[PDB]
A paper describes a structure:
[name] is a Ran-interacting protein with diverse roles in nuclear transport. Specifically, [name] enhances the rate of NES export by increasing the affinity of [name] for RanGTP, thereby stabilizing the ternary [name]/Ran/cargo complex in the nucleus. [name] belongs to a class of Ran-binding proteins characterized by one or more Ran-binding domains (RBDs) of approximately 120 residues. As expected, the [name] RBD adopts a pleckstrin homology fold, composed of 7 anti-parallel β-strands and a C-terminal α-helix.
We therefore pursued the structure of the RBD in its unbound form. We solved the structure at 1.61 Å resolution using experimental phases obtained from a platinum derivative, and at 2.1 Å in a second crystal form by molecular replacement. Crystal forms 1 and 2 contain two and four molecules per asymmetric unit, respectively, and aligning these structures reveals variations in the N- and C-terminal residues and in several loops, reflecting the inherent flexibility of these regions. In contrast, the β5β6 loop, whose functional role is evoked below, is highly uniform in structure, suggesting a comparatively rigid element. The strands define a continuous sheet with simple up-down topology, forming an imperfect β barrel that juxtaposes strands 4 and 6 and extrudes strand 5. The C-terminal helix caps the barrel, packing against strands 1, 2, 5 and 6.
Author numbering: 330 to 411, 414 to 453
The structure:
């Protein structure tokens, strides 16, 4: 793996019961790339650990069907796969980090989508 970016941020999960964001808390978020040594094909993931205690609170692989929306100047709404699992989460950060994260995710997802439509959608 190669680290693409690292940023301080705050993570929220969407709670279907209360129909509201539930704050998980702050941590260091990394976007990591891993290129296949056979196809050069790219897989990427978002990994986040709490500050201080370094406990894992996010480890989500990027997929073509993942949707990313800039929910505000300082936040990004993301979907994920995989029950009782949380489907939607929110990353809040500085305006600058949010912009960088959005751009990085956008291009990776766009690449994945291009690949899927060529491979699986004729």
């Amino acid at each position: 793996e190669s680290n693409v970016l690292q940023m301080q941020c705050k993570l929220f999960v969407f709670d279907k019961t209360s129909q509201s964001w539930v704050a998980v808390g702050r941590g260091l978020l990394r976007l990591n790339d891993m290129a296949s040594t056979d196809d050069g094909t790219l897989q990427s993931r978002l990994v986040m650990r709490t500050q201080g205690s370094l406990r894992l609170i996010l480890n989500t692989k990027l997929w073509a069907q993942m949707q990313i929306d800039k929910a505000s100047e300082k936040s990004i709404r993301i979907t994920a796969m995989d029950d009782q699992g949380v489907k939607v989460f929110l990353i809040s950060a500085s305006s600058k980090d949010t912009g960088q994260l959005y751009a990085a995710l956008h291009h990776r997802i766009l690449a994945l989508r291009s690949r899927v439509e060529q491979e699986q959608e004729a």
